[PDB]
Design an enzyme around this catalytic site. Structure first.
Site, PDB file in Angstrom:
ATOM      1  N   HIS A 181       0.751  -1.249   0.000  1.00  0.00           N
ATOM      2  CA  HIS A 181       0.000   0.000   0.000  1.00  0.00           C
ATOM      3  C   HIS A 181       0.803   1.335   0.000  1.00  0.00           C
ATOM      4  O   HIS A 181       0.259   2.458   0.055  1.00  0.00           O
ATOM      5  CB  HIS A 181      -0.885  -0.010   1.180  1.00  0.00           C
ATOM      6  CG  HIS A 181      -1.711  -1.233   1.343  1.00  0.00           C
ATOM      7  ND1 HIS A 181      -1.176  -2.362   1.797  1.00  0.00           N
ATOM      8  CD2 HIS A 181      -3.064  -1.337   1.153  1.00  0.00           C
ATOM      9  CE1 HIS A 181      -2.192  -3.170   1.890  1.00  0.00           C
ATOM     10  NE2 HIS A 181      -3.302  -2.568   1.521  1.00  0.00           N
ATOM     11  N   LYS A 212     -11.377  12.235   4.519  1.00  0.00           N
ATOM     12  CA  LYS A 212     -10.062  11.651   4.198  1.00  0.00           C
ATOM     13  C   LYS A 212      -9.126  11.712   5.421  1.00  0.00           C
ATOM     14  O   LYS A 212      -9.480  12.529   6.272  1.00  0.00           O
ATOM     15  CB  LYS A 212      -9.376  12.474   3.034  1.00  0.00           C
ATOM     16  CG  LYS A 212      -9.558  12.324   1.496  1.00  0.00           C
ATOM     17  CD  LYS A 212      -9.079  10.944   1.029  1.00  0.00           C
ATOM     18  CE  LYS A 212      -9.131  10.710  -0.490  1.00  0.00           C
ATOM     19  NZ  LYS A 212      -9.026   9.308  -0.816  1.00  0.00           N
ATOM     20  N   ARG A 213      -8.003  10.976   5.671  1.00  0.00           N
ATOM     21  CA  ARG A 213      -7.092  11.356   6.768  1.00  0.00           C
ATOM     22  C   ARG A 213      -6.682  12.810   6.546  1.00  0.00           C
ATOM     23  O   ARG A 213      -6.428  13.225   5.395  1.00  0.00           O
ATOM     24  CB  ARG A 213      -5.773  10.553   6.821  1.00  0.00           C
ATOM     25  CG  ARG A 213      -4.383  10.973   6.250  1.00  0.00           C
ATOM     26  CD  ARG A 213      -3.515   9.754   6.435  1.00  0.00           C
ATOM     27  NE  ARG A 213      -3.696   9.188   7.775  1.00  0.00           N
ATOM     28  CZ  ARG A 213      -2.681   8.485   8.265  1.00  0.00           C
ATOM     29  NH1 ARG A 213      -1.943   7.643   7.461  1.00  0.00           N
ATOM     30  NH2 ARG A 213      -2.720   8.294   9.605  1.00  0.00           N
ATOM     31  N   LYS A 249      -3.065  15.038   1.263  1.00  0.00           N
ATOM     32  CA  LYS A 249      -4.499  14.865   0.942  1.00  0.00           C
ATOM     33  C   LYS A 249      -5.240  16.177   0.491  1.00  0.00           C
ATOM     34  O   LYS A 249      -6.244  16.136  -0.234  1.00  0.00           O
ATOM     35  CB  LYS A 249      -5.233  14.178   2.186  1.00  0.00           C
ATOM     36  CG  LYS A 249      -5.626  12.658   2.173  1.00  0.00           C
ATOM     37  CD  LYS A 249      -4.673  11.492   2.585  1.00  0.00           C
ATOM     38  CE  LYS A 249      -5.530  10.196   2.612  1.00  0.00           C
ATOM     39  NZ  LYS A 249      -4.958   8.936   2.117  1.00  0.00           N
TER      40      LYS A 249
HETATM   41  C1  LIG Z   1     -13.928   3.952   3.185  1.00  0.00           C
HETATM   42  C2  LIG Z   1     -13.496   4.718   4.417  1.00  0.00           C
HETATM   43  C3  LIG Z   1     -12.446   5.652   4.329  1.00  0.00           C
HETATM   44  C4  LIG Z   1     -11.719   5.890   3.031  1.00  0.00           C
HETATM   45  O1  LIG Z   1     -10.613   6.819   2.894  1.00  0.00           O
HETATM   46  P1  LIG Z   1      -9.928   7.007   1.419  1.00  0.00           P
HETATM   47  O2  LIG Z   1      -8.738   7.845   1.606  1.00  0.00           O
HETATM   48  O3  LIG Z   1     -10.917   7.735   0.588  1.00  0.00           O
HETATM   49  O4  LIG Z   1      -9.635   5.656   0.890  1.00  0.00           O
HETATM   50  C5  LIG Z   1     -12.087   6.364   5.430  1.00  0.00           C
HETATM   51  N1  LIG Z   1     -12.697   6.133   6.622  1.00  0.00           N
HETATM   52  C6  LIG Z   1     -13.697   5.234   6.727  1.00  0.00           C
HETATM   53  C7  LIG Z   1     -14.300   5.040   8.064  1.00  0.00           C
HETATM   54  C8  LIG Z   1     -14.092   4.482   5.633  1.00  0.00           C
HETATM   55  O5  LIG Z   1     -15.100   3.545   5.745  1.00  0.00           O
END
Ligand SMILES: *Cc1c(COP(=O)(O)O)cnc(C)c1O
Ligand SMILES: Nc1ncnc2c1ncn2[C@@H]1O[C@H](COP(=O)(O)O)[C@@H](O)[C@H]1O
Ligand SMILES: Nc1ncnc2c1ncn2[C@@H]1O[C@H](COP(=O)(O)O)[C@@H](O)[C@H]1O
Ligand SMILES: *Cc1c(COP(=O)(O)O)cnc(C)c1O
Lengths: 823, 823
Positions: free
Chosen positions: A363, A554-555, A560
């Site tokens: 990842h 998003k984080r 980001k």
């Molecule tokens: C799917 C999901 C994400 C996804 O984050 P990405 O950066 O868009 O992949 C984040 N938090 C939760 C709780 C999720 O279910």
């Protein structure tokens, strides 16, 4: 004696037997009563009423795998971001309707009771949200699969926006128990640490080790309506508890207070660099879990079908270990310590079987982020293991040498041992050396895993490297969270679609139809209202339901780009302000995500967001045209709410920085149009949906590479772009902060002078690209029309598909849509 | 919501339904299966089928009590020697029979399952068996009573002899969970500690404390066939765990790992002196329990019947608190504490209430054992409670002066503050000042209580002093551990005796009906046979079922006198060896006791019997005419076994030492003759039985006090008797030691030079009494008729009597043996 059986004790669907088993559980299980029971009791009574069903199935399912003897595919992962199991177990297990009836009679509202449930804090982010889909799709596609991780007592911190500042409130979800797990003291195994290797006649011995005890917690996972329920197994650390006097170690001095605690916190906490405990956690989970695998391998009909020493000769046939990111990589040397020191397989026989038994999903896109541990860390707590890691290495570099004689720089570029200020071990170089397949998680991502980041290894063994694109489960991300939208869709085409997602493609056939138009936009209407409402009961705001729903969840981090996103909102604010009555569309701009504790820039960025928040939302001339909203303690069950109400998905990272992106997909399938850049998998979403059908913008990877080459200067954009100049000067005057105007000082300098991620570079296009969306919002028919085209496209993004692919190319197991019989 | 009922989950005697429910618990509760279940898992399946039947009843009883609103009686005691709950849940609920038909069919032997269960390691001795005993009867005679103590995680040590030596192992009975207890995380209370009483305007505040949380578990307690199941609620200490960040304490330094661990071990183990642990345990359970007690008070419609204060004026009328020993004595300053500081009652009102409400029970024979805590600990940790023990003391010596105007020495004799090098609170004096009843546990013990230790207290308040005499419970101690004698008895006089054991007088009519005479003896020979099997199968030896099975099972201690019993087993041995050929009435002496950790004499006396044994037990000249066996780890589950099977009951303490003795009574009911000195409960037993039916012998008390006045020159006794001179030189030349001869020196010299208990004085008359013991045995008809004149006279010894005297005389309620409907 066979008299004891599964065959009659759950009369399943009947809303009579369901009232029976609920009322049974409330009084006898929970040893409570209606004159005392609180919501949380009735919820626990309901969770066991649905749980009795699941283990009927689960006993059958498991027992099935012991007779049929399948290849067992063991997913190792230190995160499992599940999050609420009542509703999901009801739609998968069929039972949704009966449960609503029983509680309706009972005078309890079922929905009251499901929001009682705490998000199963075992994950933190997408690496573990992924693992979770992987668990539900594997069981749906009937593979004898098993997820393995640690149990975290305290999950990972809860977020609180105090003073529009982030305080991580603690999340002990577990402090009332968990009606879905089952402790198992009976299967408690040692995990060993520290110690000393003696080299002795038949190999070696890893003496005077400290020991911690691993104790398991099975939690079972149903597959969409086919009755296969598999085994998620989480471990807990419990010290040796001889601690009073046993070993005549104590007495002298109870510094064993510290054994007890330190060990005991290998389970206490998920992380949110170098630490003896992250690595303690990583040795822990994989020692324990390998002790289990060798055990179902040795006994599952193999204490019967030995021929070869219940040998691992047939281990890779029958067992399959998958490594999710680098955190499990110690499975490779432990199986080599187990296989050679404990049984006695000659080194080579052992290795043959390791490389054949493992695989590693990557990842990480930027190579600084690959886990690497200090050799003095390894050689202190895992002494035998550093020996093993040194010998594997040696052998790998002898194989590199046969294949490229004299590329001396190769030998050091590829090694497991990295020299520098501190000699280190590179854990991804250990996994690629030790798996028979290495896959990345995005088209683009596995390409560069081949081309730049692992290329020497891709040159030495090109076979190993594969792709396996990330996907959502259609169950949780389409039916649970978006019920009516699952409905109108099934109407037009069947029910095979939630288990055969690209059939969404038949909805193609409805693009111009003014029925599915008002249809799809009706379920979205419903969704934006439910969600309209939640916001001022849980939390309070003043939306305008009509508005654009700009979601970015998003984080929180620089790469980001929630920073460019706030720059656009300041732009909009000021535009609505300078032109008090100008018709522009409205946008409820909501950013949600948790920061990362003691990371100053992500903590400041939330302060920016909840600073604009007060200013603009208490500006009269804004009224209800512009709204900014930080979603506090954004987690899995908040995703399920909010992704449903999304219009515009924001996906603004810097190009070349995301390795895939799963929140991404979730917005596409729920009829949320993505804005975004050409990164990770915002790319394949474009390959099916169609480039026009997607707001794909800004820099691609080439231009950032080219701007890194020509030097990026942020001032130069500031001096041309005129509303930018304006809003930075606003930020410095302390427009958005009168009490400490100075406060946002570091966001300014970060941008102005030292930004790695080029926010301003993609500002300019971004305001004009977002103007494309706000012509289109307000062309409501064509708006919805692209939203349908989007959904029909979603299909390649189901975990069903990814598991099916992991099934087929690596694992060596055929999928299966058959329903298991029974209860 | 009323549809949430207890109503329909009642198959009860339906073997069909009990098997269906063992099955639900094995597959859906325990979440296990026949392919993989073990004997333990089958035990736990059975512990739950039954628990459905327990807690269904407990819900109806507890509701009942709040509908009726009875005076509730609280029994705080730190010890509850509960010992194994399944067969006893089954016989008080009549399910004994139907569980064995249901498990027979499933191909599981119920006695197997039965021996899987761990004893409830909740106690240590006489005082904890008596609590559980009272508890069982509190339930049979319908008392709304609760049991409140400390939940020991690891009990007290398990006793294991290593080569002859007591090594103490540990009793973590909770290693696999405990099916009967439900933990109540919802009901966590704080107990405060240390801190500082800050005084203001109205009253005082205890500020700045350490707070430990008490977390409760409930175990239902079933009264015989009346369907009332009451509560034993044990508290487990648990440290607040914000220790990771909160407060800001940790981060700076995690030496706070100690708070946690010092807090945890308020529950981690029982005792086996002036320990702050002891005193933190005693206080814990008091602060914890009085909170549930004012909580039930202020609830149990006493909100409704407020009229004045929800008046604590009316509190003694619906409450009772029983301080089984000095240990819950902080219950008196603590009830005061809550009442005068937190509520705002004046001191006089509160004292009226704390006096009308507590009732002490004393178990001592002698002045020296009375608990006394240095003021400097009460002031360190329990600062507010030290101030009230002082105003309580202060006020008390005024009643005393007013009533004995001028006796100064009586004021320094009644003081609650012992004076010398270290200043103590005499915690027994406290209890007499806050209670309104002080009571013995035997007629003479209560007498030396008003004649010696508390006579000045007896002179200031004659009315408080009572006697109530200990008793066993015929359910556990006759019905349950010896159904055989209970079968031969139930035909002639009827099952009504189990709830009314003075119906056993009727057995006297059958003294001369020679069928019962051989029925009684058939059973004892069957019992001894069964237990002879245990002695060759849980451990081993070579038993003989016909021999006079002689037993002593008391704690190992110098005054409780097993060393006498050794000198007599070695007299007797020698005799089989001077003239082998003269027939001698064969005996299997079994002495069994847990010594005490770090009590050298007691550790030594045990090593003697495991020596005396190795010699005589192997010697051919004996055959099996006399053998010795030390019973390893005496505990309720073995007492249920060996007490059924015994002929002789070794109750040889020095006269004047023992206060009651529950063990005594267990033996009589199970038809075994008593040999023993005229102390405490040998007194009343010989009195219902007639001295002709008892083997009383030895220095009476008078006798001892004379020998003391002249100085017990033990040497003279050595020098008149030869068979003793004999056995003394035996020990010393090392006959029972030989590899280390001098090994028994500190015993020989103890005996010869500083035996506080006159072991030689009772040698003569004792071994003569044993010669008349063996006469009768060799005349089985008459042997069994003195056994009939014994069993028939037990009646006075049921705890249902003792509790009835307690309900009626002290707690102020009348018993009820009435059946409560249920379920
Ligand atoms: C799917 C999901 C994400 C996804 O984050 P990405 O950066 O868009 O992949 C984040 N938090 C939760 C709780 C999720 O279910
Ligand atoms: N030998 C076996 N035969 C049939 N079923 C089994 C066997 N061993 C285990 N099982 C089933 O598989 C489940 C998981 O087993 P285990 O692999 O031991 O965790 C158990 O709960 C049983 O339902
Ligand atoms: N107010 C009440 N009315 C009826 N039943 C009650 C009430 N309070 C408690 N109970 C019952 O008594 C049990 C024990 O109560 P408590 O005394 O709170 O431990 C509860 O679990 C209920 O079954
Ligand atoms: C009844 C009992 C006792 C009582 O001891 P005595 O000294 O006989 O009063 C001790 N231990 C156990 C296991 C008991 O059940």
């Amino acid at each position: 004696r066979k008299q004891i059986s599964v065959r009659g004790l759950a009369g399943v669907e009947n809303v009579t037997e369901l009232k029976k088993n609920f009322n049974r559980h409330l009084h006898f299980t929970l040893v409570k009563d209606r004159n005392v029971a609180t919501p949380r009791d009735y919820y626990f009574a309901l969770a066991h009423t649905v749980r009795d069903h699941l283990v009927g199935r689960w006993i059958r399912t498991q027992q099935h795998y012991y007779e049929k003897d399948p290849k067992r595919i063991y997913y190792l992962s230190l995160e499992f971001y599940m999050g609420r199991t009542l509703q999901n177990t009801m739609v998968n297990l069929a039972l949704e309707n009966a449960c609503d009836e029983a509680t309706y009679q009972l005078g309890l509202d079922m929905e009251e009771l499901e929001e009682i449930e705490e998000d199963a804090g075992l994950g933190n982010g997408g690496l573990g949200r992924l693992a979770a889909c992987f668990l539900d799709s594997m069981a749906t596609l009937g593979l004898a699969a098993y997820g393995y991780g640690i149990r975290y007592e305290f999950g990972i911190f809860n977020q609180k926006i105090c003073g529009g500042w982030q305080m991580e409130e603690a999340d002990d979800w577990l402090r009332y128990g968990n009606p879905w797990e089952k402790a198992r003291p009976e299967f408690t195994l040692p995990v060993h640490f520290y110690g000393r290797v003696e080299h002795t006649s038949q190999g070696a011995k890893w003496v005077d080790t400290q020991v911690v005890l691993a104790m398991p917690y099975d939690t079972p996972v149903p597959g969409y309506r086919n009755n296969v329920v598999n085994t998620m197994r989480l471990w807990s650390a419990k010290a040796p508890n001889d601690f009073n006097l046993k070993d005549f170690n104590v007495g002298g001095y109870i510094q064993a207070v510290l054994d007890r605690n330190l060990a005991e916190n290998i389970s206490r906490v998920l992380y949110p660099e170098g630490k003896e405990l992250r690595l303690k956690q990583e040795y822990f989970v994989v020692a324990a879990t390998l002790q289990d695998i060798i055990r179902r391998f040795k006994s599952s009909k193999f204490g019967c079908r030995d021929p070869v020493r219940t040998n691992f000769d047939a281990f890779p046939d029958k067992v399959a270990i998958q490594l999710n990111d680098t955190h499990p990589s110690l499975a490779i040397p432990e199986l080599m310590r187990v296989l050679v020191d404990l049984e006695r397989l000659d080194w080579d026989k052992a290795w043959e079987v390791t490389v054949k038994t493992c695989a590693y999903t990557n990842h990480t896109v930027i190579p600084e982020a690959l886990e690497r541990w200090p050799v003095h860390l390894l050689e202190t707590l895992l002494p035998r293991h550093l020996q093993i890691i040194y010998e594997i290495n040696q052998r790998f570099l002898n194989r590199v040498a046969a294949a490229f004689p004299g590329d001396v720089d190769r030998l050091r570029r590829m090694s497991l041992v990295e020299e520098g200020a501190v000699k280190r071990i590179n854990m991804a170089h250990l996994c690629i050396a030790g798996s028979h397949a290495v896959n990345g998680v995005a088209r683009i991502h596995s390409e560069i895993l081949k081309k730049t980041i692992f290329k020497d290894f891709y040159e030495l063994e090109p076979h190993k490297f594969q792709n396996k694109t990330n996907g959502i489960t259609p169950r949780r991300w389409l039916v649970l969270c978006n019920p009516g939208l699952a409905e109108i869709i099934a109407e037009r085409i069947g029910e095979e679609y939630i288990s055969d997602l690209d059939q969404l493609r038949k909805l193609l056939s409805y693009v111009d139809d003014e029925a599915f138009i008002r249809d799809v936009a009706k379920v979205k209407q419903e969704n934006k209202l439910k969600f309209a409402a939640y916001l001022e009961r849980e939390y309070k705001v003043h939306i305008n339901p009509n508005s654009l729903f700009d979601v970015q969840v998003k984080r929180i981090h620089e790469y980001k780009r929630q920073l460019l996103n706030c720059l656009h909102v300041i732009t909009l604010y000021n535009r609505i302000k300078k032109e008090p009555n100008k018709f522009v569309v409205p946008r409820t701009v909501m950013i949600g995500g948790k920061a990362a504790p003691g990371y100053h820039m992500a903590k400041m960025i939330i302060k920016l967001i909840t600073a604009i928040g007060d200013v603009v939302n208490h500006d009269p001339v804004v009224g209800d045209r512009l709204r900014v909203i930080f979603l506090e303690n954004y987690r899995v069950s908040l995703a399920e709410k909010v992704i449903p109400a999304a219009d515009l998905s924001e996906q603004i990272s810097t190009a070349g920085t995301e390795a895939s992106g799963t929140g991404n997909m979730k917005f596409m399938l729920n009829g949320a149009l993505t804005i975004g850049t050409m990164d990770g998998a915002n790319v394949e979403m474009a390959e099916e949906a169609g480039e026009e059908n997607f707001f794909i913008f800004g820099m691609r990877v080439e231009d950032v590479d080219r701007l890194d080459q020509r030097g990026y200067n942020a001032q130069e954009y500031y001096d041309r772009i005129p509303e930018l100049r304006q809003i930075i000067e606003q930020l410095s005057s302390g427009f958005f902060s009168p009490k400490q105007p100075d406060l946002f000082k570091d966001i300014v300098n970060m941008l102005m002078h030292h930004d790695r991620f080029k926010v301003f570079a993609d500002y300019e296009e971004y305001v004009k690209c977002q103007e494309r969306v706000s012509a289109l919002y307000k062309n409501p028919r064509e708006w919805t029309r692209m939203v349908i085209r989007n959904i029909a496209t979603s299909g390649k993004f189901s975990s069903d598909r990814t598991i099916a692919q992991y099934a087929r190319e690596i694992w060596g197991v055929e999928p299966s849509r058959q329903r298991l019989p029974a209860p």
